[PDB]
Amino acid sequence: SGFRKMAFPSGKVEGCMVQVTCGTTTLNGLWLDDVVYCPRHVICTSEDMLNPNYEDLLIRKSNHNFLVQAGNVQLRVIGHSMQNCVLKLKVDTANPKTPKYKFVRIQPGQTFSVLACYNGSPSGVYQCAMRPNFTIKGSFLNGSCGSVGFNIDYDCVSFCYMHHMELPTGVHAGTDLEGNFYGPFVDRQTAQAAGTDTTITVNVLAWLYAAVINGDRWFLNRFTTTLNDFNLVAMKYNYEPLTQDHVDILGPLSAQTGIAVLDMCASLKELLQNGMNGRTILGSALLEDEFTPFDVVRQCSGVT
Amino acid sequence: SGFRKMAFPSGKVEGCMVQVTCGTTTLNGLWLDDVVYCPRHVICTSEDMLNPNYEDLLIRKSNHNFLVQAGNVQLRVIGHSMQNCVLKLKVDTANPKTPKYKFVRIQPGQTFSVLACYNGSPSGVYQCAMRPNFTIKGSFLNGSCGSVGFNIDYDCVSFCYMHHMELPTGVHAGTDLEGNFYGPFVDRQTAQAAGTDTTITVNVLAWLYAAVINGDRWFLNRFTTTLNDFNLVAMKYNYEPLTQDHVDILGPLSAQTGIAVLDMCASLKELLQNGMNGRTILGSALLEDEFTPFDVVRQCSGVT
Ligand SMILES: C[C@@H](C(=O)Nc1cnccc1-n1cccn1)c1cccc(Cl)c1
Ligand SMILES: C[C@@H](C(=O)Nc1cnccc1-n1cccn1)c1cccc(Cl)c1
């Protein structure tokens, strides 16, 4: 028992972290096989970031200008290309620590672990969710660009995110491993609107099921609701509308606890309308939305 | 910017995780050099745990009874000894992935990362604090025993905790790597009182400084207080009394933000007396005490 915001073990990803330097800028790269992936803004100076012409900036760069270092050993760059907002540096050596991996584009509301790095060295790991507005509320300082988000299934690392920038609002934006930004963001030093964010309803419900499993039951009530009625409350409190797909994904937790999904929705409706009244759920005084139904089942069963 | 409950990268520790089986019981072991460390209750059956005589139970065991497996390879056990509540199994092979390491006994209020494991395989990593009452609020299921807590400085892993048991209250108890329990706990299936816990005052203040650094400033006020006055409020709200040692450790954060430690205490006093009034601090609706002043400086500076 006990419920924690758990990240995946970061070992397989630590073994891929490298440092990439181009001119004056240093950031993190991800070495998989004979390719080093990093944000393309490594080629910019501070002056360039206001409105960079990446195609023109990359044209002035040669393979020998990209300095790639894995710990204390230097990698020889034999090719360079830009794919969307990432640079792919072909190196003459395949990473011996390359794990089984995939590049995946996660859906908003899905979770992942981030291995925050500086100068190609890992500093820490934390679990986070891709917000419905395609931002992440991470912990990243100058030099953290190129740190990646991932999930691990058995022995396969699914890379889903690469960190690129901090918006003026202090929230973070980045790309999938093909360099496509999540959301409307562009890699330029300009004020950029992150849309209206919402609370991930299915994740809050999954976390209410984790609470019941772990003993916190005070919020359970004598009520039920319908998808329509619950969604009128969800709209009022800026929660994602709940669908039958969400109900179906909550099936295993509903089956394990014996609490019908619409009964749990009625509990959530009462918590939204009355607050927590100074009480806590799983050590939190707010409704947690960074645990997916799969995360809850994984943590409550012990998947390694 | 951004503040997250960050765990250390777990790679160095993943490389040490092994599975230890004795009779019918399987749990996790930590392989460092030619020694495998695991909880001594691996030698007990379910019937034994009510009141085990470990010295007698271990006497019926030989080196060949301890089955140690690192992934898919079996380790040859050439020695066995009990030190307090841990068994040390000497193996004929030094772990090639043994990092630079120390065994340390942490102080209550200090933090550490846990690599939760099952059958010698890592499932996840999370940051937690050793409560003032010497328990941890972890996330551990059956099979997690032998999972360890650690901190990492540069390249050195300081192992501070090994998981042994879950109290009937759902909180966790374990030992240092010399097998000495933190707190009054014994390794037997008996109801055991965890003392009155308190909130780690210095950590809450360190986290209030992290909030100001990251932009959350609404709680700052026009007041100040004294150590004596603040401690009368701390006693009323079950907070650890603040000492000059705590004030001194907050020196760097006080210097960075320009907010005197006693001024921050006055902010904490007002938050304790009036609550958060439905507002949040760093995404939390309660006062967070699992970040030490060193954690805050490390996260806000980017130590790798
Ligand atoms: C310079 C970088 C960035 O946002 N870095 C960053 C990333 N994450 C946290 C903090 C920073 N810090 C930026 C200044 C100081 N730190 C950047 C700027 C504009 C656009 C793009 Cl794609 C990338
Ligand atoms: C059996 C084990 C234990 O507490 N394991 C555990 C540890 N952590 C989480 C859950 C468990 N679960 C126990 C039953 C089901 N799970 C134990 C019992 C009595 C004393 C000692 Cl030192 C160790």
XYZ file of C-alpha atoms and ligand atoms in Angstrom:
654
model
C 0.000 0.000 0.000
C 0.851 3.701 -0.415
C 0.568 5.840 -3.547
C 3.373 7.892 -4.942
C 4.010 10.040 -8.029
C 6.374 7.393 -9.412
C 8.721 7.839 -12.336
C 10.098 4.936 -14.429
C 13.621 3.774 -13.471
C 15.861 6.043 -15.569
C 18.870 3.752 -16.184
C 18.117 2.855 -19.815
C 17.743 6.570 -20.613
C 20.811 7.736 -18.612
C 22.959 5.513 -20.837
C 21.802 7.519 -23.904
C 22.469 11.061 -22.597
C 25.177 13.055 -24.360
C 26.251 16.709 -24.476
C 25.953 18.612 -27.742
C 27.804 21.903 -28.275
C 27.596 24.125 -31.310
C 29.536 27.347 -31.182
C 28.647 28.899 -27.807
C 25.490 26.855 -27.022
C 25.520 23.580 -25.081
C 22.470 21.374 -24.508
C 21.525 17.662 -24.181
C 21.396 15.083 -26.900
C 19.943 11.558 -26.987
C 22.267 8.924 -28.507
C 20.377 5.924 -29.926
C 22.190 3.582 -32.323
C 24.499 5.813 -34.489
C 22.296 8.940 -34.230
C 22.326 11.823 -31.748
C 19.001 13.659 -31.428
C 18.905 17.181 -29.993
C 16.858 20.414 -30.289
C 17.769 22.338 -33.420
C 18.081 25.599 -31.423
C 21.584 24.327 -30.384
C 22.722 26.137 -33.632
C 21.364 29.516 -32.454
C 23.114 32.249 -30.522
C 21.044 34.417 -28.056
C 20.675 37.035 -30.847
C 19.267 34.362 -33.243
C 16.394 33.166 -31.013
C 14.104 36.231 -31.635
C 13.271 35.055 -35.197
C 15.720 32.292 -36.290
C 16.060 31.125 -39.865
C 17.108 27.546 -38.973
C 17.695 26.504 -42.577
C 20.150 29.408 -43.013
C 21.786 28.940 -39.597
C 22.319 25.199 -40.189
C 23.877 25.901 -43.631
C 26.801 27.678 -41.918
C 27.424 24.523 -39.802
C 29.495 21.513 -40.726
C 29.771 18.054 -39.064
C 32.946 19.221 -37.223
C 31.056 22.143 -35.615
C 28.776 19.794 -33.600
C 30.761 18.692 -30.568
C 29.209 15.530 -29.073
C 30.519 14.161 -25.818
C 29.281 11.046 -23.943
C 30.719 11.437 -20.446
C 34.400 11.952 -21.186
C 34.539 10.463 -24.735
C 34.091 12.429 -27.889
C 31.909 11.154 -30.726
C 32.860 11.698 -34.386
C 30.026 13.409 -36.345
C 29.765 12.050 -39.899
C 26.355 13.480 -40.903
C 23.838 16.142 -39.864
C 20.228 16.792 -40.779
C 17.280 18.726 -39.534
C 13.894 16.990 -39.164
C 11.233 19.525 -38.024
C 12.724 21.091 -34.757
C 15.354 18.377 -34.077
C 18.822 17.860 -35.423
C 19.973 14.282 -36.142
C 23.729 13.949 -35.943
C 24.963 10.734 -37.453
C 27.972 9.469 -35.488
C 30.501 6.775 -36.525
C 29.754 4.682 -33.370
C 26.522 2.995 -32.314
C 25.751 3.611 -28.605
C 26.593 0.315 -26.840
C 24.014 1.163 -24.172
C 21.165 1.695 -26.694
C 18.095 0.042 -25.171
C 15.132 -1.399 -27.160
C 13.227 1.740 -28.009
C 10.451 3.337 -30.000
C 9.582 6.955 -30.821
C 5.967 7.646 -29.921
C 3.724 10.682 -29.951
C 1.716 10.670 -26.721
C -1.824 11.902 -26.384
C -2.737 14.849 -24.139
C -3.616 13.528 -20.659
C -1.012 10.750 -20.942
C 1.875 10.632 -18.480
C 5.627 10.125 -18.801
C 8.880 10.338 -16.842
C 11.391 13.111 -17.547
C 15.113 12.697 -17.001
C 16.254 16.267 -16.480
C 19.845 16.663 -17.676
C 22.532 19.401 -17.822
C 25.681 19.171 -19.984
C 24.664 15.596 -20.881
C 24.585 14.574 -17.191
C 21.403 13.401 -15.472
C 20.298 15.505 -12.491
C 16.918 13.968 -11.613
C 13.769 12.126 -12.652
C 10.120 13.048 -12.193
C 6.743 11.946 -13.435
C 4.517 14.430 -15.233
C 1.520 14.636 -17.584
C 1.170 16.200 -20.997
C -1.509 18.847 -20.220
C -4.619 18.914 -22.440
C -3.188 22.248 -23.773
C 0.070 20.375 -24.838
C 2.373 21.978 -22.284
C 4.094 20.220 -19.379
C 4.647 21.674 -15.901
C 8.194 20.444 -15.546
C 11.301 21.515 -13.692
C 13.871 22.753 -16.190
C 16.594 25.412 -16.043
C 18.970 26.838 -18.731
C 20.903 23.874 -20.180
C 18.058 21.363 -19.705
C 17.042 21.482 -23.396
C 17.307 18.074 -24.999
C 16.228 16.284 -21.754
C 13.612 13.641 -22.750
C 10.288 12.182 -21.602
C 9.665 8.454 -21.874
C 7.672 5.435 -20.744
C 9.025 1.884 -20.313
C 7.197 -1.366 -21.097
C 9.165 -4.518 -20.115
C 12.537 -3.688 -21.812
C 11.323 -1.105 -24.380
C 11.795 2.630 -23.880
C 9.167 4.631 -25.723
C 10.544 8.150 -26.115
C 7.708 10.625 -26.304
C 9.135 14.040 -25.518
C 12.261 16.212 -25.946
C 12.438 19.487 -24.013
C 12.799 22.702 -26.046
C 11.515 25.760 -24.208
C 10.027 27.563 -21.325
C 7.144 29.887 -22.132
C 7.056 33.312 -20.384
C 4.375 31.736 -18.106
C 6.947 29.263 -16.668
C 5.370 26.206 -18.335
C 7.302 23.992 -20.725
C 7.000 23.093 -24.398
C 8.752 20.526 -26.500
C 8.566 18.027 -29.298
C 8.114 14.326 -30.118
C 11.409 12.626 -31.289
C 10.621 13.482 -34.940
C 10.885 17.200 -33.915
C 7.162 17.998 -34.084
C 6.074 20.317 -31.253
C 3.213 19.251 -29.038
C 0.751 22.107 -29.315
C 0.969 25.350 -31.268
C 4.463 26.221 -30.090
C 7.340 27.374 -32.297
C 11.032 27.308 -31.297
C 11.520 31.089 -31.124
C 11.875 33.631 -28.237
C 8.432 35.094 -28.656
C 5.391 35.280 -26.335
C 3.238 32.312 -27.245
C -0.225 31.503 -26.095
C -0.732 28.101 -24.455
C -4.473 27.447 -24.802
C -7.013 27.098 -22.002
C -5.962 24.064 -20.012
C -8.425 21.658 -18.399
C -8.235 19.009 -15.655
C -7.813 15.430 -16.942
C -11.085 13.911 -15.643
C -10.283 10.256 -16.359
C -6.972 10.580 -14.416
C -8.677 12.206 -11.397
C -11.171 9.291 -11.351
C -8.327 6.774 -11.727
C -6.640 8.452 -8.702
C -9.945 8.328 -6.703
C -9.908 4.519 -7.344
C -6.244 4.440 -6.165
C -7.361 6.257 -3.000
C -10.112 3.635 -2.238
C -7.639 0.792 -2.905
C -5.166 2.385 -0.467
C -7.735 3.088 2.273
C -8.817 6.713 1.736
C -12.609 6.301 1.416
C -14.155 9.372 3.173
C -15.194 10.908 -0.199
C -17.344 7.880 -1.196
C -21.044 8.745 -1.022
C -24.643 7.407 -1.422
C -25.032 9.012 -4.854
C -24.745 8.203 -8.472
C -24.920 10.347 -11.614
C -25.163 10.047 -15.425
C -22.495 10.913 -18.074
C -24.665 13.916 -19.063
C -25.208 15.193 -15.517
C -21.534 14.677 -14.541
C -20.396 16.517 -17.714
C -22.475 19.608 -16.849
C -20.429 19.741 -13.565
C -17.180 18.994 -15.480
C -17.875 21.956 -17.830
C -18.497 24.307 -14.874
C -15.197 23.309 -13.207
C -13.012 23.180 -16.365
C -12.697 19.390 -16.421
C -12.406 17.362 -19.635
C -15.782 15.921 -20.719
C -15.957 12.232 -19.767
C -16.715 9.798 -22.588
C -17.637 6.080 -22.776
C -13.975 5.465 -23.892
C -12.838 6.928 -20.523
C -15.457 4.790 -18.663
C -14.176 1.655 -20.519
C -10.553 2.415 -19.592
C -11.708 2.709 -15.938
C -13.257 -0.809 -16.192
C -10.409 -2.664 -14.442
C -10.431 -0.245 -11.444
C -14.220 -0.314 -11.240
C -14.009 -4.167 -11.273
C -11.229 -4.289 -8.616
C -13.029 -1.965 -6.158
C -16.617 -2.889 -7.016
C -17.463 0.844 -7.358
C -19.305 1.594 -10.616
C -17.662 4.329 -12.717
C -20.794 6.583 -12.491
C -20.838 6.111 -8.706
C -17.202 7.326 -8.604
C -18.261 10.242 -10.882
C -20.893 11.206 -8.228
C -18.094 11.270 -5.624
C -16.028 13.537 -7.916
C -19.094 15.746 -8.552
C -19.536 16.226 -4.758
C -15.779 16.972 -4.322
C -15.951 19.557 -7.134
C -19.081 21.210 -5.696
C -18.071 21.138 -1.964
C -14.259 21.000 -2.055
C -12.242 18.778 0.305
C -13.461 20.589 3.506
C -9.886 20.666 4.809
C -9.378 16.920 4.336
C -6.815 15.135 2.144
C -6.805 12.287 -0.389
C -3.582 10.257 -0.721
C -1.637 13.098 0.950
C -3.022 15.779 -1.376
C -5.412 18.693 -0.586
C -6.424 18.948 -4.276
C -7.719 16.649 -7.012
C -4.711 14.965 -8.656
C -4.832 14.441 -12.466
C -1.291 13.165 -13.264
C -2.014 9.457 -12.790
C -3.629 7.639 -15.684
C -5.817 4.506 -15.190
C -2.875 2.409 -16.528
C -0.500 4.103 -14.027
C -2.825 3.253 -11.122
C -3.140 -0.418 -12.175
C 0.660 -0.635 -12.727
C 1.480 0.897 -9.331
C -1.189 -1.068 -7.464
C -0.103 -4.425 -9.053
C 3.703 -3.965 -9.131
C 4.620 -4.112 -12.835
C 8.423 -4.088 -13.309
C 11.741 27.365 -13.548
C 9.201 24.859 -12.183
C 9.446 22.747 -9.029
C 8.994 19.029 -8.958
C 9.297 16.216 -6.400
C 12.453 14.958 -8.122
C 14.152 11.649 -7.475
C 17.847 10.963 -8.235
C 18.514 9.161 -11.551
C 18.271 5.479 -10.576
C 20.738 3.894 -13.042
C 23.610 3.293 -10.603
C 21.173 1.566 -8.224
C 19.334 -0.469 -10.917
C 22.659 -2.119 -11.771
C 22.880 -3.463 -8.177
C 19.379 -5.000 -7.889
C 19.191 -8.776 -7.544
C 16.525 -11.304 -6.532
C 17.035 -13.357 -3.386
C 14.988 -16.510 -2.743
C 15.117 -18.675 0.337
C 12.723 -21.576 0.464
C 9.335 -20.102 -0.505
C 10.123 -16.382 0.043
C 11.475 -14.085 -2.675
C 12.531 -10.468 -2.127
C 15.125 -7.922 -3.381
C 18.803 -7.856 -2.659
C 21.457 -5.179 -3.247
C 24.683 -6.473 -4.850
C 27.707 -4.275 -4.069
C 31.198 -5.686 -4.656
C 31.034 -9.435 -3.697
C 28.217 -9.010 -1.131
C 24.437 -9.240 -1.505
C 22.475 -7.334 1.150
C 18.834 -8.213 1.818
C 16.294 -8.200 4.695
C 16.826 -11.144 7.014
C 13.082 -11.977 6.948
C 13.781 -13.678 3.545
C 14.497 -16.800 5.749
C 10.999 -16.744 7.303
C 7.851 -18.487 6.158
C 4.427 -16.768 6.783
C 4.080 -18.879 9.977
C 7.503 -17.632 11.240
C 6.765 -13.880 11.041
C 4.533 -13.745 14.207
C 7.570 -14.130 16.529
C 10.645 -15.275 14.514
C 13.802 -16.583 16.122
C 16.142 -15.401 13.323
C 19.244 -16.969 14.852
C 17.500 -20.376 14.889
C 15.914 -19.944 11.444
C 19.248 -18.938 9.861
C 20.989 -21.975 11.447
C 18.838 -24.299 9.298
C 20.047 -22.440 6.152
C 23.172 -23.107 4.153
C 24.864 -21.041 1.383
C 23.135 -23.231 -1.271
C 19.673 -22.366 0.132
C 20.026 -18.653 -0.799
C 19.206 -18.376 -4.486
C 20.587 -15.093 -5.885
C 19.769 -14.072 -9.417
C 20.909 -10.888 -11.238
C 18.584 -10.651 -14.235
C 19.011 -14.073 -15.807
C 22.383 -15.068 -14.232
C 22.760 -16.983 -11.038
C 25.290 -15.955 -8.398
C 27.228 -18.543 -6.363
C 26.823 -17.962 -2.582
C 30.057 -18.707 -0.700
C 29.221 -17.132 2.692
C 26.252 -15.912 4.740
C 25.950 -13.794 7.857
C 23.376 -11.821 9.718
C 24.158 -8.242 10.813
C 21.210 -6.809 12.828
C 18.118 -7.242 10.463
C 20.074 -7.774 7.202
C 21.660 -10.831 5.705
C 25.007 -10.437 3.893
C 25.521 -13.125 1.291
C 29.084 -13.304 0.103
C 29.154 -14.219 -3.595
C 32.149 -15.433 -5.666
C 31.750 -12.530 -8.176
C 32.085 -8.792 -7.602
C 29.232 -6.843 -9.272
C 30.790 -5.246 -12.387
C 28.218 -2.449 -12.157
C 29.079 -1.574 -8.516
C 29.115 2.226 -8.332
C 31.170 4.309 -5.832
C 29.059 4.011 -2.724
C 28.770 4.584 0.991
C 26.373 3.276 3.649
C 24.914 6.175 5.604
C 22.343 6.546 8.344
C 20.150 9.530 7.476
C 18.626 11.882 9.989
C 14.849 12.254 10.383
C 13.634 15.056 8.081
C 16.235 14.151 5.436
C 15.093 13.035 1.991
C 16.064 10.199 -0.345
C 15.012 8.429 -3.542
C 13.541 4.920 -3.423
C 13.900 2.446 -6.265
C 10.912 0.183 -5.747
C 11.705 -3.315 -7.017
C 9.934 -6.701 -7.386
C 11.769 -9.997 -8.027
C 15.006 -7.993 -8.380
C 13.509 -5.856 -11.184
C 13.037 -2.099 -10.847
C 9.442 -0.876 -11.184
C 9.756 2.830 -10.336
C 11.516 5.655 -8.516
C 10.148 8.284 -6.152
C 11.435 10.864 -3.734
C 10.390 10.694 -0.096
C 11.384 11.905 3.381
C 12.245 9.981 6.508
C 9.433 11.219 8.821
C 10.442 12.639 12.222
C 8.815 9.443 13.665
C 11.260 7.280 11.521
C 8.663 5.886 9.133
C 8.405 6.608 5.404
C 5.175 7.048 3.433
C 6.271 4.994 0.466
C 4.600 2.906 -2.197
C 5.442 -0.746 -1.618
C 3.554 -3.996 -2.235
C 4.347 -7.664 -1.330
C 7.747 -8.474 -2.881
C 9.123 -4.923 -2.529
C 11.213 -5.802 0.557
C 14.886 -5.180 -0.056
C 14.162 -2.115 -2.287
C 16.574 0.672 -1.176
C 16.665 4.419 -0.504
C 19.674 6.459 -1.574
C 21.125 9.861 -2.399
C 23.760 10.591 -5.074
C 26.592 13.129 -4.856
C 28.637 13.442 -8.095
C 29.380 9.701 -8.713
C 28.837 8.361 -5.157
C 25.666 6.535 -4.138
C 24.984 6.877 -0.433
C 22.625 4.053 0.511
C 20.529 5.067 3.475
C 17.527 2.767 3.576
C 16.415 -0.830 2.870
C 12.685 -1.591 2.936
C 11.477 -4.207 5.446
C 7.828 -3.774 6.383
C 4.490 -2.162 6.216
C 2.889 -1.314 9.545
C -0.870 -2.017 9.961
C -1.323 1.776 9.446
C -0.028 1.514 5.833
C 3.226 3.385 6.557
C 6.625 1.826 5.948
C 9.568 0.856 8.134
C 13.045 -0.277 7.294
C 16.705 -0.236 8.138
C 20.050 1.418 7.330
C 22.431 -0.898 5.308
C 23.945 -2.268 8.550
C 20.441 -3.694 9.348
C 19.550 -1.226 12.113
C 15.882 -0.180 11.958
C 15.053 3.497 11.819
C 12.753 4.011 14.776
C 11.459 1.529 17.334
C 10.402 -1.067 14.784
C 11.160 -4.792 14.947
C 10.963 -7.199 11.980
C 7.961 -9.201 13.222
C 4.229 -9.354 12.234
C 3.003 -7.513 15.280
C 1.115 -4.211 15.732
C 3.774 -1.601 16.358
C 3.343 1.963 17.399
C 4.926 4.604 15.154
C 5.274 7.659 17.409
C 3.556 11.021 17.005
C 4.793 12.437 13.728
C 5.420 16.141 13.148
C 5.803 18.384 10.081
C 9.429 19.098 9.091
C 9.479 22.898 9.605
C 12.850 23.601 7.973
C 11.727 21.728 4.799
C 8.420 23.649 4.600
C 10.410 26.920 4.836
C 12.890 25.670 2.218
C 9.879 24.928 -0.063
C 8.406 28.434 0.627
C 11.773 29.834 -0.647
C 11.472 27.533 -3.719
C 7.985 28.974 -4.293
C 9.279 32.627 -4.236
C 12.155 31.685 -6.577
C 9.653 30.113 -9.000
C 7.151 32.998 -8.886
C 4.551 31.978 -6.278
C 4.689 34.976 -3.902
C 1.054 35.571 -2.744
C 1.842 34.213 0.769
C 4.601 36.810 1.424
C 3.447 39.379 3.980
C 4.375 42.608 5.883
C 5.211 40.686 9.064
C 8.110 39.240 10.889
C 8.368 37.037 13.985
C 10.937 35.692 16.486
C 12.171 32.064 16.940
C 10.228 31.973 20.244
C 6.982 33.376 18.829
C 7.149 31.175 15.692
C 7.795 28.072 17.862
C 4.643 28.682 19.939
C 2.712 28.467 16.591
C 4.806 25.434 15.500
C 3.885 23.616 18.759
C 0.161 24.340 18.247
C 0.238 22.948 14.681
C 2.514 19.921 15.330
C 5.532 21.352 13.510
C 9.131 20.628 14.535
C 10.585 23.430 16.701
C 12.850 25.639 14.573
C 16.416 26.086 15.814
C 19.335 28.391 14.879
C 20.873 25.326 13.069
C 17.763 25.260 10.810
C 18.013 29.074 10.283
C 21.732 28.671 9.326
C 20.930 25.914 6.811
C 18.323 28.283 5.274
C 21.063 30.958 4.858
C 21.711 30.339 1.141
C 17.968 30.584 0.261
C 17.515 33.655 2.444
C 20.557 35.206 0.646
C 19.286 34.260 -2.859
C 15.773 35.695 -2.328
C 16.664 38.528 0.048
C 13.884 37.361 2.429
C 15.131 37.032 6.022
C 14.467 33.604 7.572
C 12.258 35.130 10.351
C 10.277 37.035 7.706
C 9.633 33.702 5.920
C 8.666 32.220 9.338
C 6.007 35.000 9.661
C 4.627 33.932 6.259
C 4.488 30.301 7.466
C 2.853 31.418 10.747
C 0.086 33.209 8.759
C -0.387 30.140 6.476
C -0.676 27.881 9.547
C -3.168 30.206 11.271
C -5.322 31.087 8.183
C -4.775 28.141 5.822
C -4.303 28.601 2.061
C -7.818 30.140 1.524
C -8.325 27.892 -1.505
C -5.064 28.972 -3.153
C -2.059 26.816 -4.093
C 1.729 26.977 -3.697
C 3.840 25.234 -6.366
C 0.787 23.175 -7.414
C 0.001 22.031 -3.866
C -2.998 22.930 -1.624
C -1.014 21.987 1.519
C 2.341 22.829 3.096
C 4.973 20.522 1.567
C 7.728 19.182 3.895
C 9.572 16.648 1.663
C 12.094 19.084 0.177
C 15.138 19.889 2.266
C 17.052 23.216 1.927
C 19.810 21.280 0.058
C 17.181 19.766 -2.300
C 15.810 23.232 -3.126
C 19.289 24.664 -3.853
C 20.183 21.560 -5.942
C 16.970 21.721 -7.991
C 17.075 25.500 -8.416
C 20.783 25.465 -9.524
C 20.855 22.260 -11.628
C 23.356 19.989 -9.847
C 24.013 16.809 -11.882
C 16.783 29.436 -24.527
C 15.711 28.355 -24.704
C 14.858 28.105 -23.456
O 13.661 28.387 -23.426
N 15.510 27.522 -22.415
C 14.932 27.098 -21.194
C 14.228 25.899 -21.128
N 13.681 25.436 -20.001
C 13.828 26.170 -18.892
C 14.501 27.377 -18.840
C 15.060 27.855 -20.017
N 15.727 29.119 -19.988
C 15.689 30.106 -20.920
C 16.377 31.167 -20.403
C 16.812 30.738 -19.151
N 16.430 29.495 -18.882
C 14.761 28.687 -25.850
C 14.276 29.979 -26.018
C 13.298 30.250 -26.963
C 12.802 29.237 -27.765
C 13.318 27.964 -27.620
Cl 12.728 26.684 -28.638
C 14.290 27.679 -26.682
C 5.692 -9.667 4.940
C 6.537 -8.424 5.245
C 5.872 -7.101 4.851
O 5.514 -6.282 5.695
N 5.747 -6.891 3.513
C 5.264 -5.716 2.889
C 6.085 -4.600 2.757
N 5.693 -3.473 2.158
C 4.450 -3.431 1.666
C 3.546 -4.474 1.745
C 3.958 -5.639 2.375
N 3.022 -6.714 2.497
C 2.828 -7.536 3.561
C 1.751 -8.321 3.262
C 1.353 -7.918 1.989
N 2.116 -6.946 1.506
C 6.892 -8.336 6.726
C 5.941 -8.612 7.701
C 6.217 -8.386 9.041
C 7.452 -7.896 9.427
C 8.405 -7.663 8.456
Cl 9.974 -7.075 8.923
C 8.145 -7.881 7.118
